[PDB]
DNA sequence: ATCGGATGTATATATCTGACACGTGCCTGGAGACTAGGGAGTAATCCCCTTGGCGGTTAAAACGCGGGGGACAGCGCGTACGTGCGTTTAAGCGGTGCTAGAGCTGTCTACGACCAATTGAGCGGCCTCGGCACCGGGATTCTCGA
DNA sequence: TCGAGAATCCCGGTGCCGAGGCCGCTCAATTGGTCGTAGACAGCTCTAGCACCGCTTAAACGCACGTACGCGCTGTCCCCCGCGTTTTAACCGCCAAGGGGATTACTCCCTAGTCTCCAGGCACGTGTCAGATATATACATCCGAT
């Protein structure tokens, strides 16, 4: 009955940290890889276990960014990440 | 034709320290890929170290001084002692 | 103990035959010494034994017999000096270490 | 047969899929502007990996980006991936 | 009716009436966007016009002369001198 | 007297030190700091006199590359100071400790 | 002689002279003990790999190249000493 | 152009004699091809030419003739491509790029 | 003893682009230790590309693909085209 | 403090499944014998560079003071993110077809290793001088209390 | 919106040494020969990737709403900057001394290379068992109302 703002999220976190399936879906991510690989060759043919190795290496990086988005958004004394938090964590790490 | 692995040599050491416990096939491929990666860190580091002193031989002395660089701390004090035990027990036997 | 299969002369379970092959046709140096694949196969035994001790250790806590990759990340990231060795790495289909930052926990 | 210039497959990385990657990172409240910023940071990570992943095949004279070559592309950037060989 | 000279040192000028480069064509504004330091290249001093600020695409350059102001700028002295 | 305001001896000494090269940690408290830490690994090690300066230059250009990362992490909290809850952020982001 | 507390010779201006090169404006005075807890952590990693490259070479002198290989180990480099 | 000194056959100023030596007694692979030290000496010519173009370029701004190491960091960090190539590196006795964060600038 | 360097060879490229300027001996040791670093990243990377494909030769094609792996963007495209311009003066003449 | 639901979460059977631990065959890589050989160890010199000391000189640190501003808490607002409920619209799936490309075998031609025979560019050593350190007058200018 | 102040800039003269230019001089570069073998061909088999389709519904999508969090605006006080005075150890330039690095020169023994042997271990076909859904349930944390 419209449980409180915030504790669906802490029930959502403990589900997802205790599970290990892949979070981005297979077919939209397979069309993102076949879009970005059009710039570097035309009519490539991805071997279908190399659109898992581009998934489990990419969402293990996006998760590892949100662990470092959250540590700097806590640092600004709030609980809301923002795009001025992400571009700190990419800049301090040295992706710029 | 044939693709070699470290699949069986992991499997004896699994049944050595956990003699009832199996392993999967995806989590064998990690432990196959982990052994190949600690090789090319150690034999990489023990190759440049042979070059910096202008020797041409990876002897046992280099891999003592390549484990002691990569392996951080308490794994370094063990895997040196697990090495020189096993290089005496090869030589004396 | 034995004469054939130089691992059995050393007392390892990792092959010293394969490691002495992979120090020559990997082109690491010119002339690999005879003691060198013995020392290297013992270290790769020990780090595989250190992981698979801690891997099946955290398989009994989740009460399953066989080891899935999720147990390997729980053996690696929970350790204090295997986390430094596998610092850069991502273990495929392996989850994360369960933690919340404790500011976000309720009152 | 079909010359489809594929565009806007980036909008398949959906707003309830950046929420669940946020949850596995363990973060609580997400802004409205994250969802068009993470796709800017996803398309930068995939551009660097696939450009190396193609180059490893284009040198090897194949037309398949096989999973040995994605793993080698990730190993060169210092993000090793255990699980597919090496 | 145009001062197409310059100064390197106080003895000699760089004329730009008949000869010259395309560097002469930029005019005066009292607010600067370019200066010209005198550098030496192999015994003889060329005169080189740098920038001060990030000039944009088709943003018209300025130059101070430092001896009216027909720039149209308000924040300026109303003359050249 | 003629008092410089709080703030513009700082923004002079920023623009002085960023426009300069030379070493900022004095050498004799770095010659005897390196020999403290080497005395816990191998006793009675001599140092080549270049190999102190190779340690000084790689430590001066580490701490500068740290302080450029706290000051982005401090401005992020709308401050102009830097506190030790910034260095322990900018090292945790960069994967140091 | 066995020495201690040499790290307080990295004195309170010499942290703040270093921090101006980073381009910081105000320095809260608790920094001067966090920074010496960072320079000691960093010099323990470099010198212990620098001693190890001498210990292999059977020497009693940490030469100039044996720091540059110990820096190339950790992911820095130093151009200038060989 | 010439016959001796392969660099002069290629038109480089970097030696192709030394590079073909340093691809054999560096032990990089078994059998280095004949075109391989030519291509490698041309690239090391070009990256040295790209730096020393930009180094003395910012030597002219300073107004000094010779290049000190301070000019090299001003040539490397001001250029994006070079910066990417030399990302990890520290150029010894070389200062920093002059910048202040613009929040700290006055009103 | 004979300790070689790239000292004179950098000097003949400084007296091409900027034919009046000189170079300090500290900023010679940087360029002597720059060339010694881009060597080990090009021959270091083109010793994996001629090992993953089970070749055994560093040909002149790997040093092309080593350069397009390391060098970013528009330094790759100009140094690739500086390469094949200079190996074709080698093959013809 | 605590009720009343209450509701998803973690704790127990069921039982089917297709992943895995296991049993046969074989084959190729590992093991030994031994050979020549060069690379490393082990002496030896020798002298270069580091450790130690000290006598200065003084830049620099250490200290204390005032005063100012920046941090930090508080409060109130308003907006926008969460919650969910209701509803679409592909994802997933499995299934069959299809074929373009990957892998392997085998021929066979170019080509890099290697040897010696020669030598000439490159390093080391030595002279030398001009580019920059190093300070003085002044002109600007950069802030701040008028 | 500014005149006194002071730090910086800048331009100058005079001096230092370290960049640059040569003189001889050795070993590494050249080459011109053999030599097999690595890679380059076509060629062929096949399998794995792609294209498609029907379905089933799990998940995205949109909207409404109310609520808590961000933000901004305050005041406070504390603590950091600024600066003068005294203090002290860094620095430079001596000294000298000897340890250890660097090279040379015998010497030898480890190992590379080759062959002869053979079983370890690879892929394959096998049953079987520890799973994961499929299913009702006991109770932890959560919530509106008290
Ligand atoms: C130094 S020349 C400039 C080049 C010249 N305007 C041309 O483009 O050929 C001087 C000329 O600039 C113009 N000028 C000088 N001061 C100016 C100002 N403050 N605003 C606009 N024009 C100016 C004068 O008319 C004079 O003829
Ligand atoms: Zn005007």
Walk me through the domains of chain G, giving residue ranges and CATH numbers: 1-82 (1.10.20.10)
Q: Classify F62 as helix, strand or coil.
A: helix
Rounded-to-integer distance, Cα B66 and Cα B70, Å: 6
* Chain C positions in Cβ-Cβ contact with residue A53 (cut-off 8 Å): 92
In three-state secondary structure terms, G61 is strand
Task: Give the 3-state DSSP-derived string for chain E, with helices as H, strands as E and coil as C.
Answer: CCCCCCCCCCCCCCCCCCCCCCHHHCCCCCCCCCCEEEEEECCEEEEEECCCCCCCCCCCCCCCCCCCCCCCCCCCCCCCC
Tell me the β-bridge partners of G62. Answer: F47
Nucleotides of strand K under 7 angstroms from a protein beta carbon: 5-9, 18-20, 27-31, 38-40, 48-52, 59-61, 66-71, 79-84, 89-91, 99-103, 110-112, 119-123, 130-132, 142-144
User: Is H36:I58 a contact under the CB 8 Å cutoff?
Assistant: yes
Resolution in A: 3.7
CATH number for the domain that contains residue B67: 1.10.20.10
Which protein residues have a CB closer than 5 Å to ligand 2 (ion)? E 69, 71, 73, 76
Distance CA G9, CA F28 (A): 9
| Angle CA D27–D32–D35, to nearest 5 | 75
F63: enclosing H helix or E strand: helix F50-75
CA atoms of I42 and H23, how far apart (whole Å): 11
β-pairing, E36-41 with E44-49?
A: antiparallel
Tokens of E54: 């990030």
How many Å apart are CA A3 and CA G63, to the nearest integer? 67
Domain total for chain B? 1
CATH architecture classification, C1-107: Orthogonal Bundle (1.10)
CATH code for position A43:
1.10.20.10
Please give the C-alpha separations between residue E5 and each of E23, E33, E50, E80, in angstroms, as whole numbers.
Answer: 12, 20, 19, 16
**DSSP characters over chain C:** --SSSHHHHHT-SS-HHHHHHTTTTTTSSS---SSHHHHHHHHHHHHHHHHHHHHHHHHHTTT-SSPPHHHHHHHHTTSSSSTTTTSS-EETT--------TTSS--
Integer Cα distance of I23 and H48 in angstroms: 13
Contact A28 D13 (CB under 8 A): yes
Chain D's closest residue to B3, CA to CA, is: D85
Burial of residue A84 (number of CB atoms within 10 Å: 0-12, 13-18, 19+): middle
Return the number of other C-beta atoms located less than 10 Å from residue G63's C-beta.
20
Please state, in angstroms and rounded to a whole number, the distance separating the CA atoms of residues H45 and I83.
10
In three-state secondary structure terms, G79 is strand
**G48-52 contacts, C-beta under 8 A, 24 or more apart:** G48/F41, G49/B69, G49/G73, G49/G74, G50/F51, G50/F55, G51/F38, G51/F41, G51/F42, G51/F45, G52/B65, G52/B68, G52/B69
Chain D 43-62 residues in 7 Å CB range of strand J = 62
Displacement of CA A93 from its chain's centroid (Å): 17
Residues of chain B contacting G53 with CB distance shorter than 8 Å: 49, 52
* Sign of the dihedral defined by the CA atoms of residues E45, E49, E53, E57, in that order: negative
- φ, ψ of residue A54 in degrees (nearest 5): -90, 0
H62-76 burial, b at 16+ Cβ within 10 Å, e below that, comes to eeebebbbbbbbbbb
Q: Are strands A45-46 and D64-65 parallel, antiparallel or unpaired?
A: parallel
Nucleotide with C1' nearest the C4 CA: J31
Query: What is the full DSSP assignment across F17-48?
Result: HTT--S--S-SHHHHHHHHHHHTTTSSS-EE-
Distance, in Å, from the CA atom of F6 to the CA atom of F81, rounded to the nearest integer, reads: 13
Extract the tokens encoding H54: 């930009």
Token pair 């020392």 is at which residue?
A: C39
Closest CA to H94 of G81, F47, F11: G81
Q: What is the C-alpha separation between F14 and G23, in angstroms, rounded?
A: 6
Query: What's the rounded Cα separation, in Å, for the pair I31 and C33?
Result: 36
Rounded CA separation E74/E68 (Å): 12
Specify whether the CB–CB gap between E64 and E75 falls below 8 A: no
Q: How many CB atoms lie within 10 A of CB D2?
A: 3
* Residue F46: φ, ψ to 5°: -80, 160
Residues of F near A (Cβ–Cβ under 8 Å) read 69, 72-73, 76-78, 85-86, 89-90, 92-95
- Distance between the alpha carbon (CA) of D9 and the C1' atom of J8, Å: 36
DSSP state at residue D82 = E
Q: Which residues of E are annotated as a binding site for S-adenosyl-L-methionine?
A: 65
Q: Is the distance from CB of C37 to CB of C20 less than 8 angstroms?
A: yes
Cβ G13 to strand J below 7 Å: yes
3-state secondary structure of D65: strand
Can you tell me the distance from the alpha carbon of H102 to that of H81, in angstroms, rounded to the nearest whole number? 25
Of D6, D17, D30, the CB nearest to A35: D6
What DSSP string describes A45-85?
EE-TTTTTTTTTTTHHHHHHHHHHHHHHHTTTT-SEE-HHH
In sequence order, the 6+-apart residues with CB closer than 8 A to the CB of B83 are B60, B63, B64, B67, C39, C42, C43
Pairing of strands D29-30, A80-81: parallel
Q: Containing domain of residue F59, as a range? A: 1-97
CA angle D77, I69, I61 (to 5 degrees): 145
C-alpha atoms less than 13 angstroms from C-alpha of E12 in its C-beta half-sphere: 6
Give the CA-to-C1' distance from C86 to K141 in angstroms: 37
Distance I36 CA to J111 C1' (A): 29
Q: What is the H or E stretch that residue D30 is in?
A: strand D29-30
If 0-12 CB within 10 Å is exposed, 13-18 middle and 19+ buried, where does residue B11 land? middle
Tell me the angle at which helices G12-22 and F50-75 cross, rounded to the nearest 10 degrees.
Answer: 70
Tell me how far apart the alpha carbons of residues F33 and F26 are, in angstroms, rounded to a whole number: 11
**From the alpha carbon of E65, which atom of ligand 1 is closest?**
1
Distance I16 CA to J114 C1' (A): 38
Place of tokens 């450009």: D51
Q: Is D78 left (phi over 0), alpha (psi -120 to 50) or beta?
A: left
- What are the φ/ψ torsions at residue E52 (nearest 5 degrees)? -100, -45
Listed residue (D29, D20, D22, C62) closest to A21, CA to CA: D20
Radius of gyration (C-alpha) of chain H in whole angstroms = 19
The minimum CA-CA distance between F2 and chain G, rounded to whole Å, is 22
Question: Would you call D63 helix, strand, or coil by DSSP?
Answer: coil
In chain J, which nucleotides are within 7 Å of a protein Cβ?
Answer: 8-10, 19-21, 28-32, 39-41, 49-51, 60-62, 67-72, 80-85, 90-93, 100-105, 111-113, 120-124, 131-133, 143-145
**Does at least one atom of strand J sit less than 7 Å from the CB of H68?**
yes
The ligand 1 atom at the shortest distance from the C-alpha of residue E30 is: 19
Write phi, then psi, for F49 (nearest 5 degrees): -70, -20
Q: Measured between alpha carbons, how far is F88 from G45 in angstroms, rounded to an integer? A: 18
SS3 H67: strand
Q: Which long-range contacts (CB under 8 A, 24 or more apart) does H1-9 make?
A: H1/I93, H6/H38, H6/I90, H7/H41, H9/I89, H9/I90, H9/I93
Asked if D46 contacts A96 with a C-beta cutoff of 8 angstroms, the reply is no
Q: Are H10 and I89 in contact (CB under 8 A)?
A: yes
The pairing of strands E44-49 and A45-46 is unpaired
Q: Which two tokens stand for residue B18?
A: 């956990």
Method: cryo-EM
Which residues of E are less than 8 Å from I19 in CB distance? 42
Report which secondary-structure segment, H or E, holds D64. strand D64-65
Q: Which residue segment(s) compose the domain that I14 sits in?
A: 1-93
Instruction: Name the residues in B4-63 having a C-beta closer than 7 Å to nucleic acid strand J.
Output: 11, 22-26, 55-57, 59, 61
What separation in angstroms does the CA of H101 have from each of A65, D45, F18, G20, H98?
Answer: 24, 27, 13, 12, 10
Instruction: Say if residue F73 is exposed, middle or buried (CB neighbours under 10 Å; 0-12, 13-18, 19+).
Output: buried
Look at chain F and report how many structural domains it folds into.
1
Q: Give the strand pairing for E44-49 and F46-47.
A: unpaired
Q: Is the dihedral of CA F85, F91, F96, G3 positive or negative?
A: negative
Question: How far is residue F7 from each of residues A22, A31, E37, F70, F73, measured CA to CA in Å?
Answer: 52, 54, 31, 19, 20
Distance between CA atoms of residues B36 and G27, nearest Å: 47
Phi, psi of E47, deg, nearest 5:
-120, 125
Q: Confirm if H95 and F18 have CB atoms less than 8 A apart.
A: yes
Going by the DSSP 8-state scheme, the letter that residue H91 receives in this structure is B
* Distance, CA of A90 to CA of A95 (rounded, Å): 5
Q: Say how many Å lie between the first and final Cα of chain A, rounded.
A: 46
Residues in Cβ contact with I87 at an 8 Å cutoff, skipping those fewer than 6 apart: H10, H35, H38, H39, H42, I60
Distance E18 CA to ligand 1 centre (A): 16
**Alpha carbon distance H29, C97 (integer Å):** 41
Report strand pairing: A80-81 vs D64-65.
unpaired
Q: Write out chain C residues lying below 8 Å of D78, CB-based.
A: 88
d(CA B93, CA A27) in angstroms, rounded, equals 59
Phi then psi dihedrals of residue H100, to 5 deg: -120, 145
Sequence-ordered list of residues with C-beta below 8 angstroms from that of G80, at least 6 positions apart, any chain: F54, F57, H69, H91, H92, H93, I26, I29, I30, I33
């Amino acid at each position: 009955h419209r449980y409180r703002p915030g504790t669906v999220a802490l029930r959502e976190i403990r589900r997802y940290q205790k599970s290990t399936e892949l979070l981005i879906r297979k077919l939209p991510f397979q069309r993102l890889v076949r879009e970005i690989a059009q710039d570097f060759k035309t009519d490539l043919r991805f071997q279908s276990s190399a659109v898992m190795a581009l998934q489990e290496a990419s969402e293990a990086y996006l998760v590892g960014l949100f662990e470092d988005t959250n540590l700097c958004g806590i640092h600004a004394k709030r609980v809301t990440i923002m795009p001025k938090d992400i571009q700190l964590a990419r800049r301090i790490r040295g992706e710029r | 034709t044939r693709k070699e692995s470290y699949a069986i040599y992991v499997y004896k050491v699994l049944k050595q320290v956990h003699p009832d416990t199996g392993i999967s096939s995806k989590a064998m491929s990690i432990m196959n890929s982990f052994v190949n990666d600690v090789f090319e860190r150690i034999a990489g580091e023990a190759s440049r170290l042979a070059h910096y002193n202008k020797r041409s031989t990876i002897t046992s002395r280099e891999i003592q001084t390549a484990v002691r660089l990569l392996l951080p701390g308490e794994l370094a004090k063990h895997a040196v002692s697990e090495g020189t035990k096993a290089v005496t027990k090869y030589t004396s036997a | 103990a034995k004469a054939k299969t130089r691992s059995s002369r050393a007392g390892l379970q990792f092959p010293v035959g394969r490691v002495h092959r992979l120090l020559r046709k990997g082109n690491y140096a010119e002339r690999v010494g005879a003691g060198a694949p013995v020392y290297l196969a013992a270290v790769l035994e020990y780090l595989t034994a250190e992981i698979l001790e801690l891997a099946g250790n955290a398989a009994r806590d989740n009460k399953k017999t066989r080891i899935i990759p999720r147990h390997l990340q729980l053996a690696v990231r929970n350790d204090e000096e295997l986390n430094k060795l596998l610092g850069r790495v991502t273990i495929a289909q392996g989850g994360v270490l369960p933690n919340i930052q404790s500011v976000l926990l309720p009152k | 047969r079909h010359r489809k210039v594929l565009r806007d497959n980036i909008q398949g990385i959906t707003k309830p899929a950046i929420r669940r990657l946020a949850r596995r990172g363990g973060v609580k409240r997400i802004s409205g502007l994250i969802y068009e910023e993470t796709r800017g940071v996803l398309k930068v990570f995939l551009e660097n990996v696939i450009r190396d992943a193609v180059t490893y095949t284009e040198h090897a004279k194949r037309k398949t980006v096989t999973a040995m070559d994605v793993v080698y592309a990730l190993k060169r950037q210092g993000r090793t991936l255990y699980g597919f060989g090496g | 009716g145009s001062s197409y000279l310059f100064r390197i040192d106080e003895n000699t000028v760089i004329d730009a009436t008949k000869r010259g480069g395309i560097a002469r064509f930029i005019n005066h504004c009292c607010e600067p966007s370019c200066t010209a330091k005198i550098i030496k290249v192999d015994g003889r001093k060329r005169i080189v016009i740098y920038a001060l600020r990030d000039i944009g695409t088709n943003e018209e350059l300025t130059y101070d002369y430092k001896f009216p102001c027909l720039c149209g700028a308000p924040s300026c002295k109303g003359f050249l001198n």
